[PDB]
């Protein structure tokens, strides 16, 4: 059975409009969106669809590109490290649930050579 997904507005949390924030959503989130390796990521994983019951057994800080999309969309963050933070946790969730020699970890690992080479471009 899946939780509820992240959450993508919170009032009360201080929110905050930068540049580099801008560019994370305009040019590193977008780009990375339109990867081949992108769909497993544009949502939360489905613990019951993929029959990966235990995965939510395992990964206690879920994280995915849509609900980053979202946040973003939204101005959930304070900053950029908030968000490249979200990123981080996508990428080392996967690696940790998943096997070294997997299809998903290799999607991942491009994704996050891309992410990388992105953000060292942060304005
Ligand atoms: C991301 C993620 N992190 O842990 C798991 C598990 C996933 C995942 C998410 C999906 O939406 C689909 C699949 C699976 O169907 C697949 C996808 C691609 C290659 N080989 C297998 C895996």
Redesign the pocket.
């Known amino acids: 059975m899946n939780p509820p997904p992240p959450e993508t507005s919170n009032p009360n949390k201080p929110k905050r409009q930068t540049n580099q924030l801008q560019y994370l959503l305009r040019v590193v989130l977008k780009t990375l969106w339109k990867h081949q390796f992108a769909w497993?990521?544009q949502q939360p994983?489905d613990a019951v669809k993929?029959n990966?019951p235990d995965?939510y057994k395992i990964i206690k800080t879920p994280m995915d590109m849509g609900t980053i999309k979202k946040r973003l969309e939204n101005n959930y963050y304070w900053n950029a490290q908030e968000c490249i933070q979200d990123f981080n946790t996508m990428f080392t969730?996967?690696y940790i649930?998943?096997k070294p020699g997997?299809?998903?970890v290799l999607?991942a690992e491009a994704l996050e050579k891309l992410f990388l080479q992105k953000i060292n471009e942060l304005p």
Do not use: W
């Open positions: 497993p990521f994983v993929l990966c995965y969730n996967c649930y998943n997997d299809d998903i999607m």
